[PDB]
Design an enzyme around this catalytic site. Structure first.
Site, PDB file in Angstrom:
ATOM      1  N   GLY A  49       4.017  19.472   7.483  1.00  0.00           N
ATOM      2  CA  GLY A  49       4.937  19.249   8.594  1.00  0.00           C
ATOM      3  C   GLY A  49       6.381  19.078   8.134  1.00  0.00           C
ATOM      4  N   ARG A  50       7.314  19.369   9.027  1.00  0.00           N
ATOM      5  CA  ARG A  50       8.752  19.291   8.746  1.00  0.00           C
ATOM      6  C   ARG A  50       9.428  18.864  10.032  1.00  0.00           C
ATOM      7  NH1 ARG A  50      12.583  20.793   4.746  1.00  0.00           N
ATOM      8  NH2 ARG A  50      10.919  21.694   3.448  1.00  0.00           N
ATOM      9  N   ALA A  65      12.575  14.727   7.687  1.00  0.00           N
ATOM     10  CA  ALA A  65      11.356  14.444   6.963  1.00  0.00           C
ATOM     11  C   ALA A  65      10.549  15.703   6.713  1.00  0.00           C
ATOM     12  CB  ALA A  65      10.523  13.418   7.719  1.00  0.00           C
ATOM     13  N   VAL A 119       6.383  16.643   5.247  1.00  0.00           N
ATOM     14  CA  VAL A 119       5.081  16.139   4.797  1.00  0.00           C
ATOM     15  C   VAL A 119       4.407  17.276   4.059  1.00  0.00           C
ATOM     16  CG1 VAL A 119       2.832  15.145   5.433  1.00  0.00           C
ATOM     17  CG2 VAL A 119       4.880  14.801   6.900  1.00  0.00           C
ATOM     18  N   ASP A 155       5.478   6.851  20.981  1.00  0.00           N
ATOM     19  CA  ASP A 155       5.609   8.307  20.724  1.00  0.00           C
ATOM     20  C   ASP A 155       4.195   8.911  20.626  1.00  0.00           C
ATOM     21  OD1 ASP A 155       7.178  10.686  20.232  1.00  0.00           O
ATOM     22  OD2 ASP A 155       7.423  10.293  18.120  1.00  0.00           O
TER      23      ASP A 155
HETATM   24  O1  LIG Z   1       2.096  14.794   9.438  1.00  0.00           O
HETATM   25  C1  LIG Z   1       1.689  13.670   9.123  1.00  0.00           C
HETATM   26  C2  LIG Z   1       2.462  12.537   9.402  1.00  0.00           C
HETATM   27  O2  LIG Z   1       3.679  12.703  10.047  1.00  0.00           O
HETATM   28  C3  LIG Z   1       1.973  11.264   8.996  1.00  0.00           C
HETATM   29  C4  LIG Z   1       2.647  10.050   9.237  1.00  0.00           C
HETATM   30  C5  LIG Z   1       1.937   8.856   9.302  1.00  0.00           C
HETATM   31  C6  LIG Z   1       2.568   7.632   9.540  1.00  0.00           C
HETATM   32  C7  LIG Z   1       3.922   7.554   9.719  1.00  0.00           C
HETATM   33  O3  LIG Z   1       4.529   6.335   9.982  1.00  0.00           O
HETATM   34  C8  LIG Z   1       4.647   8.741   9.632  1.00  0.00           C
HETATM   35  O4  LIG Z   1       5.984   8.735   9.780  1.00  0.00           O
HETATM   36  C9  LIG Z   1       4.019   9.959   9.397  1.00  0.00           C
HETATM   37  O5  LIG Z   1       0.781  11.154   8.333  1.00  0.00           O
HETATM   38  C10 LIG Z   1       0.055  12.284   8.039  1.00  0.00           C
HETATM   39  C11 LIG Z   1      -1.145  12.158   7.352  1.00  0.00           C
HETATM   40  C12 LIG Z   1      -1.910  13.286   7.032  1.00  0.00           C
HETATM   41  O6  LIG Z   1      -3.078  13.145   6.351  1.00  0.00           O
HETATM   42  C13 LIG Z   1      -1.507  14.552   7.420  1.00  0.00           C
HETATM   43  C14 LIG Z   1      -0.312  14.664   8.108  1.00  0.00           C
HETATM   44  O7  LIG Z   1       0.051  15.888   8.482  1.00  0.00           O
HETATM   45  C15 LIG Z   1       0.479  13.546   8.424  1.00  0.00           C
END
Ligand SMILES: O=c1c(O)c(-c2ccc(O)c(O)c2)oc2cc(O)cc(O)c12
Length: 274
Positions: free
Chosen positions: A23-24, A28, A30, A140
Site C-alpha cells: 500500500g501507498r 506512507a 507499506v 476511519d
Molecule cells: O496496509 C496495511 C496497513 O496500513 C496497516 C496498518 C496498521 C495499523 C496502523 O496504525 C497503520 O497505520 C497501518 O497494517 C497492515 C498490515 C498488513 O499485514 C498488511 C497491510 O497491508 C497493512
C-alpha cells in the site's frame, strides 16, 4: 533530531524487504518484509515524520500507543517492532494475507455467503467493542481499513490504520453525518461505518456515493439510502434491520457495539455442536 526507536542498520540486519508493495498513501508506504532469522512475513509501514510542513512524530507515537493498548485483542492488527531513521518511523506489523474486506464488496467477487458476512461483522463488532470499552474511536472504519488474515479460506478480521483514532474531511462517502455537521467525536460514528460495511458486503454497492461530492454529502445528510426490493432481493430482513438501525441521522439512536452483538441477525448455532 534525535531518534527514539531501533536503528535502520538494525532493520536491515534483521529484515529483508520483498518486491510486494502492499500500500501507498501520500505520506506512507507499506511493504512486505521477512525476518532473516525466522522467515516470518510481516508488513512494514513506513510513516513519514514530516507532513504538510507539520512535524508529526507525536501523532505517530499516539498511533503506536493505541496499537499497543489493543495488543490483546486479536481483531486489531498487532504491532511486532518499531524502527526509525531520519525521515520515517517504521512499524513492523502482523501480516494479513487476505487483503481488504473491500475486495469482498465489489461486483467481481460471488463467493461470500450470509454465514461469512455474519461472522465478519461479528468479528468487526468484537474489535470495535474492545476499542470503545477503552475509549478509542477509530474514526476511519472504511472497508479498506479492515483486512483479513486469509481468503483461501476466508479468515479473521484485523482492523488497521489507526491514524485518525481519538478518545471520545476524509473520503466523502464514509463520513458520518455528525462529522459533516462538526459535532463532537462519538463512538456512534464507528457504528455508522459498520452499517456501511454490512450494506456493502451484502449489496456490493456503496450506500451513499453520488455522481459527485455534493450529491454524496446530500445523500449522507438526508440519509438517502437505497433499500429497494431490487437491491435487497437476496438480502434478509434481519440483515436489513441491522443495517437500518445503524444508518440513522441522529448518533444517539444508534445502538452500541455491545447491543449490536446481541442483534438477532447475528445469533447462529454452529450445526457441528451438540
Ligand atoms: O496496509 C496495511 C496497513 O496500513 C496497516 C496498518 C496498521 C495499523 C496502523 O496504525 C497503520 O497505520 C497501518 O497494517 C497492515 C498490515 C498488513 O499485514 C498488511 C497491510 O497491508 C497493512
Amino acid at each position: 533530531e534525535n531518534l527514539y526507536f531501533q536503528s535502520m542498520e538494525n532493520f536491515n540486519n534483521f529484515y529483508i524487504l520483498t518486491s510486494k508493495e502492499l500500500g501507498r498513501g501520500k505520506f506512507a508506504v507499506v511493504r512486505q518484509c521477512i525476518s532473516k532469522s525466522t522467515g516470518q512475513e510481516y508488513a512494514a509501514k513506513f510513516l513519514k515524520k514530516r507532513r504538510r510542513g507539520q512535524d508529526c512524530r507525536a501523532e505517530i507515537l499516539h498511533e503506536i500507543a493505541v496499537l499497543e493498548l489493543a495488543k490483546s485483542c486479536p481483531r486489531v492488527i498487532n504491532l511486532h517492532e518499531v524502527y526509525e531513521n531520519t525521515s520515517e518511523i517504521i512499524l513492523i506489523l502482523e501480516y494479513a494475507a487476505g487483503g481488504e474486506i473491500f475486495s469482498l464488496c465489489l461486483p467481481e467477487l460471488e463467493m461470500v455467503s450470509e454465514n461469512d458476512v455474519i461472522r465478519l461483522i461479528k468479528q468487526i463488532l468484537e474489535g470495535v467493542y474492545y476499542l470503545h470499552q477503552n475509549n478509542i474511536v477509530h474514526l476511519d472504519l472504511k472497508p479498506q481499513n479492515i483486512l483479513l488474515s486469509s481468503i483461501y479460506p476466508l479468515g479473521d478480521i484485523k482492523i488497521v490504520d489507526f491514524g485518525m483514532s481519538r478518545k471520545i474531511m476524509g473520503t466523502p462517502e464514509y463520513l458520518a453525518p455528525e462529522i459533516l455537521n462538526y459535532d463532537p467525536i462519538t463512538t456512534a460514528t464507528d457504528m455508522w461505518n459498520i452499517g456501511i460495511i454490512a450494506y456493502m458486503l451484502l449489496t456490493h454497492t456503496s450506500p451513499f456515493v453520488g455522481e459527485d461530492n455534493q450529491e454524496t454529502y446530500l445523500n449522507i445528510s438526508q440519509v438517502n439510502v437505497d433499500y429497494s426490493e431490487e437491491t435487497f432481493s437476496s438480502v434478509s430482513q434481519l440483515a436489513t434491520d441491522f443495517i437500518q438501525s445503524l444508518l440513522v441521522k441522529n448518533p444517539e439512536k444508534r445502538p452500541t457495539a455491545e447491543i449490536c452483538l446481541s442483534h438477532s441477525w447475528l445469533q447462529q448455532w454452529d450445526f457441528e455442536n451438540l
